[PDB]
């Protein structure tokens, strides 16, 4: 029993973190096989960020300008290329600590763990969700760029995020491991306001099922609703519309607890309309939306 | 910017996790040097837990009865001893992945990371605090026993907790790495109710300073208070009394933000008396108490 915001064990990712320096800029790189992945803005000075021409800036850079250090040892750079907003630095040595890995581009609402790093060294690990507006609410300071987000299935690490920037509103934007930004963000220091941060309805329901499994049941009521009726409430409270696909993904949780998805939607509807009345659910005084239905099943079953 | 419940990178601890089986019971062990540490209740059957005589149960066990597996390879057990509520299994091979380590017995209010494991395999990592009643609010299922709590200072892992049991109330009890339980708990299946779970006042103040650093300032008011006046409020709301030692530990946060500790106590006092009025602080709708002043400084400065 108990339910926590749990991150994947970070060891497999720690063995991939390196430090990349270009000129006076130092950030984090991800070393997998004989390639180091890092944000392309490593080639910029703070002044360049206002309007950088990355292709032009990269012409003045040679292999010997990218200083790649793994712990206390220096990697030899034998090639460099830009793929979208990431640089790929070919090194002469395959990372001996390279785990089984994949590069995946996640969908909004999906969760992942972040290993925050500075100077190629890990500082901490926490669980995040890709918000519906494609930002992440992380914890990053200057130097954290190149820190990565990932999920783990048994022995395979699926890398989904690489940190690039902080928006003026304190939220975070970044790319997948192919260098494509999530959302409309660009790696430029300009007005990039975020869209509406809606609540991930399917995750709140999954977390409500997690609460029932762990003993927190005060919010269960005598009511039911329909998808269309629930969605009228969800729209009013800036919640994502719930679809039949979401109901289907909640099936195993519905089966385990014996509480039909639409009955749980009616509990959520009353919680939205009436609030928590000074009460808590799984130690939270608000509706948590950064646990997917898969996360709840995983934590509640003990998948390693 | 941003503030998250961050755990230490778990890699150094992942390399120490092993599976220990005795008879029909399997739990986690911690392999450091040529010794495997595990909860002594590994020698019990579920029936034995009602009133176990560990010394008598251990007489029927020989070195060959403790099956210790590290990944897919078997460790040879050349000695066994019981130290308080932990068993120390001497193996013939030093763990090559043994990090620099210490065993520390933490004080209530202190925080630590937990690497939850099942069958010697890690499932996840999360940040915890030793509650003032000596329980921990974790996330553990059957098989998680032997999972450990730790802190990391640069390259040294300080092991502070080993998981032993779940109380009937869903909270968790365990020992330090010398086998001594935190609090009055015993490794017996009996009525062991927990004392008052008070709020760690010094941590709430540290988190309020973290909020100011990250932009959340609505709770700052025009008032001040005294230690004795604040403590009258703290007693009413089951908060730990604030001492001059706590004020002293909050000094660096007070210095960074320019907000005197007693002024922050007056903000906390008004938050206790009036509530949050439907507002949030660092994404929480309640006063968070599982960040120490050291945690706040560490996260806000980027210590790796
Ligand atoms: C300081 C900080 C805190 C947290 N996370 C990241 C950062 N760093 C940055 O944002 C660096 N940086 C500055 C301007 C700019 C423009 C575009 C871009 F891709 C990166 C940019
Ligand atoms: C099932 C579970 C869930 C979460 N964390 C731990 C557990 N396991 C246990 O508590 C095992 N166990 C059962 C009786 C008993 C008595 C004393 C003791 F030290 C261990 C005991």
Swiss-Prot record, chains A, B:
Full protein name: 3C-like proteinase nsp5
Covalent link (Glycyl lysine isopeptide (Lys-Gly) (interchain with G-Cter in ubiquitin)) residue numbers: 5, 90
Function: Cleaves the C-terminus of replicase polyprotein at 11 sites. Recognizes substrates containing the core sequence [ILMVF]-Q-|-[SGACN]. Cleaves and inactivates human TRMT1, preventing tRNA guanine(26)-dimethylation of tRNAs. May cleave human NLRP1 in lung epithelial cells, thereby activating the NLRP1 inflammasome pathway. May cleave human GSDMD, triggering alternative GSDME-mediated epithelial cell death upon activation of the NLRP1 inflammasome, which may enhance the release interleukins 1B, 6, 16 and 18. Also able to bind an ADP-ribose-1''-phosphate (ADRP).
Result after altering residue 49 to A: Does not affect ability to cleave and inactivate human TRMT1
Complex formation: 3CL-PRO exists as monomer and homodimer. Only the homodimer shows catalytic activity. Interacts with host FBXO22; this interaction promotes the proteasomal degradation of nsp5.
Occurrences of domain Peptidase C30 (ranges): 1-304
Reaction equations catalysed: TSAVLQ-|-SGFRK-NH2 and SGVTFQ-|-GKFKK the two peptides corresponding to the two self-cleavage sites of the SARS 3C-like proteinase are the two most reactive peptide substrates. The enzyme exhibits a strong preference for substrates containing Gln at P1 position and Leu at P2 position
Top-level lineage group: Viruses
Location relative to the cell: Host cytoplasm; Host Golgi apparatus; Host nucleus
Regulation: Inhibited by pyridone-containing alpha-ketoamides compounds 13a and 13b. In turn, alpha-ketoamide 13b (tert-butyl (1-((S)-1-(((S)-4-(benzylamino)-3,4-dioxo-1-((S)-2-oxopyrrolidin-3-yl)butan-2-yl)amino)-3-cyclopropyl-1-oxopropan-2-yl)-2-oxo-1,2-dihydropyridin-3-yl)carbamate) inhibits SARS-CoV-2 replication in human lung cells. Inhibited ex vivo by michael acceptor inhibitor N3. Inhibited ex vivo by compound 11a and 11b.
Cytoplasmic side: 1-304
Residues at the active site: 41 (for 3cl-pro activity), 145 (nucleophile)
Organism in which the protein naturally occurs: Severe acute respiratory syndrome coronavirus 2
Lineage, uppermost ranks: Viruses, Riboviria, Orthornavirae, Pisuviricota, Pisoniviricetes
Consequence recorded when altering residue 90 to R: In strain: Beta/B.1.351
